[PDB]
Amino acid sequence: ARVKHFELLTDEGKTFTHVDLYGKYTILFFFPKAGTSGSTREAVEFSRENFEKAQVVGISRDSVEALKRFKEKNDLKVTLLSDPEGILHEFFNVLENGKTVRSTFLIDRWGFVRKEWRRVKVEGHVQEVKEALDRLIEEDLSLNKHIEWRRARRALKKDRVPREELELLIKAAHLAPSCMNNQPWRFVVVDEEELLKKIHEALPGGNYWMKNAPALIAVHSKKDFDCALPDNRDYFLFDTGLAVGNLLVQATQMGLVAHPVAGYDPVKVKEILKIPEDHVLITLIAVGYLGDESELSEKHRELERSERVRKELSEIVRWNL
Amino acid sequence: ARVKHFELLTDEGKTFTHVDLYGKYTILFFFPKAGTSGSTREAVEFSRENFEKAQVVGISRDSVEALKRFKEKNDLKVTLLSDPEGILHEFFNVLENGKTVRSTFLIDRWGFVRKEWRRVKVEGHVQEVKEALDRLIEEDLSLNKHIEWRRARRALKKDRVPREELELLIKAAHLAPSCMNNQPWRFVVVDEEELLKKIHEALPGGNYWMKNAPALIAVHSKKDFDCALPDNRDYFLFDTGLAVGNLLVQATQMGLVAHPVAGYDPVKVKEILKIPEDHVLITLIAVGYLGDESELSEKHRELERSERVRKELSEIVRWNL
Ligand SMILES: Cc1cc2nc3c(=O)[nH]c(=O)nc-3n(C[C@H](O)[C@H](O)[C@H](O)COP(=O)(O)O)c2cc1C
Ligand SMILES: Cc1cc2nc3c(=O)[nH]c(=O)nc-3n(C[C@H](O)[C@H](O)[C@H](O)COP(=O)(O)O)c2cc1C
Structure with missing residues (x-):
């Protein structure tokens, strides 16, 4: 204690x-x-x-x-x-x-x-x-093991994810901080086959792999849900990003792939899920247990088995002046 | 293995x-x-x-x-x-x-x-x-302990945070996913005393507590650094939020307070740090070891070890239709 x-x-x-x-x-x-x-x-x-x-x-x-x-x-x-x-x-x-x-x-x-x-x-x-x-x-002063292990994995099992597990992903997301504690994030958790199949029709060819996912989480928000401050500092999507960051860490810990995407028709998905037209549908998160890489395109399989790809640190951080 | x-x-x-x-x-x-x-x-x-x-x-x-x-x-x-x-x-x-x-x-x-x-x-x-x-x-299927423990703490010790520890916060942030792997996040880590003092003058009085922080991390990005897709789906700040979300988890694991704020004059701070005018300075993160809450305002002192305050889950998540 x-x-x-x-x-x-x-x-x-x-x-x-x-x-x-x-x-x-x-x-x-x-x-x-x-x-x-x-x-x-x-x-x-x-x-x-x-x-x-x-x-x-x-x-x-x-x-x-x-x-x-x-x-x-x-x-x-x-x-x-x-x-x-x-x-x-x-x-x-x-x-x-x-x-x-x-x-x-x-x-x-x-x-x-x-x-x-x-x-x-x-x-x-x-x-x-x-x-x-x-x-x-x-243990403590090294890279967090869940942050390190999380990858944009595309091989997913069809096996249903229990609702109690899906809910824990949302609970973790909800513990993110936000400007003025506005909590601007909103989620629609989709695990009904008929609903999923409708969403599949709104996906581009390159996101075929999402069709295996037994669950999709639609993440949406609206600008006036959060601080909007001088010099173009709108917080709704940034803060929603904090929440989704938590979500991915929680999923990874639980042995779940949680893969946020931008490849979809937002208007159609909002229509299917009855999300207000004036909301931004910022990501659709494919959630599932790890599946069989042999179902993936060669390109996707290679990305999956290859090491992390990132810019050198010097391109994204500077120290003092 | x-x-x-x-x-x-x-x-x-x-x-x-x-x-x-x-x-x-x-x-x-x-x-x-x-x-x-x-x-x-x-x-x-x-x-x-x-x-x-x-x-x-x-x-x-x-x-x-x-x-x-x-x-x-x-x-x-x-x-x-x-x-x-x-x-x-x-x-x-x-x-x-x-x-x-x-x-x-x-x-x-x-x-x-x-x-x-x-x-x-x-x-x-x-x-x-x-x-x-x-x-x-x-352990695996319960709420992540670092997500659970992370709070917007305001009592900070003045003790220097070693650069190797500050580096790790940035490394963890950089492992966030992003649309098309664009990696739109940018950081200026400030630990030089005179530079910190200049930044302090651009803070509002209510953020007095930040002045004890031995390091501030300025987080900035620009719209064309990331995907900008139809239906108002701009990704740069959302993706930067994913990165900061990772940063906060890493800090918490390391016994560091990492507290992102919006209370500052963005134009003044960007000028001080030579961040380009067309960037958005979306947060300043105060980083330091946990200090003495007795040094905080009465309101902040009450918050320092208060229970989490959030909306009921039903207000932010819906299942299917
Ligand atoms: C906002 C967002 C949207 C993404 N959209 C897609 C997508 O539509 N299709 C896809 O195959 N991957 C998508 N990705 C996955 C990224 O391509 C992946 O995170 C990136 O290549 C880095 O790989 P890594 O996360 O394994 O380190 C998306 C990631 C983010 C953050
Ligand atoms: C983008 C952002 C800006 C924030 N700005 C401030 C600030 O200027 N001053 C402050 O005392 N707290 C600020 N906070 C802290 C929040 O008030 C805090 O996260 C919220 O009250 C919930 O508290 P919790 O994170 O401990 O759960 C900020 C948080 C975020 C995410």
Whole structure:
């Protein structure tokens, strides 16, 4: 769970709070009492490592003065928290039979606990924690796996997608932010065969692959549904884009292809789906489980099995001036 | 890894391929030989259990006929694959000195191996696999955690965000899809202090909170950078929204607040950053680690850890007609 708001004094008499957890990874190590052999070893061993993108914080029920002495005598280079009242000891549930059970936690940049060790054995502990931290940082500070995996796949199974799954795609989309929280996005989820077959007639030849999709999501909006600000800053389609971005990530996580297209007759599709004529039908999203690439044109099959194609980063981003 | 393309015959003599793994979760259990005591028990126990949203597939080097008999004798309700040539036995690496090691795999809807058991002990195995599958399905088929956690947070620390982390936000954005792969999005990442101060003067007072951000990302595009199709379907801002949507997910995973705004003077900011006059500056994204909400206005403070505010789903989605 997330670490609650709190305030504790450090070995330096300073106030350490939840805010001091934010923006860093934290190794939080609970020890029973400053000065003992095992706890001295643990603190010294944590102190002598160099943790990439993390801080080390020791915590016990000791007094500030005791912790200060503990640090001074061992030349410790970590923060120590005095928790005489056991506020965090209780929150992390490290007390048993009234005594502290040596325990260690990894906390992320939002303050969420990501890993724990209970009934810690000091021998080998720091190295195990170090290795777990490196793995956690590798996981979080690398490209999101769903963003990376999402492709404009065109091979779709005909198997029906359960409505509860389709609905989750919409729920995720709806959690996008928007100007003034206008939420300008609108969706028509189509999973009725007869309706689908009518929409198929409004598709160009190159979108034959959409005909396998057991579901299509029509995404529409209207300018006055959102902010329209100076210098041509109309937000309705941008914000709807934020929503569809979420939708594709959610689909990819769920093992669904969600492929937004522009290839269709908008007037016909709006007519079929009874979408107001003054709305923009900005995309039609084909949704389905992954199917059989051998049904695709050679061109589409090659796009599908080939690597991502993008401009060099320098063509789309500049740093300062 | 992802499962190779293959075709094998089932106990019914039907062809089963990797396409038959797609769109389902699969428990694939290898056993050395049909009819032995342990393998009989394993198959019987898998068949008796219920696995929601998954299929159970046994596989050995036995003939189709031997598998048919094995199924009939034990009233098995699973698919069995005949693999005399050891095509999947080799791929899954279950052969030790040419002999099959009892092994089981969980494969997701994309065909990725998500969990494995090797040198399997039959007793308790089916239950262990059920629990692991249930957990797998729980995570994949629930709301994406980063989408769920992303909020328009306004308390930002002044702490520098390393360029390697800022680079990753842009990389994730650039992996968005776009009409004709046009990639219409453009970014100026600002982290130089004096440049940030100039931008601050073009912000309205109500966006005071942005002035603590150590980085601002200016997002701009132009209509002719993307598809412009009939019925008022201009794609440049929609597609840029897809990109920013990815950016926000990536930031959230990394423990960064990424908060897109519309409160700024676009002409002033474009001038400061040398963005061409005919571009639309559609958002400024404040990026930073989470800071102290106590520094926010009373209204913003209440919002900082408030519940999500959205329209009811029925207001933004319709099913079919
Ligand atoms: C708004 C939009 C419309 C698209 N329209 C089509 C389409 O009509 N037909 C099609 O085969 N692909 C279409 N695509 C898919 C793109 O061609 C694809 O995203 C792009 O080539 C990049 O490939 P990638 O997403 O796998 O990285 C569309 C994508 C977007 C964002
Ligand atoms: C395009 C856009 C512009 C926004 N502009 C501002 C802004 O100028 N100032 C601000 O305090 N919040 C702004 N927001 C944040 C929204 O108000 C916020 O996303 C909305 O209230 C919903 O909150 P949530 O994202 O936490 O769910 C903007 C959001 C978007 C998508």
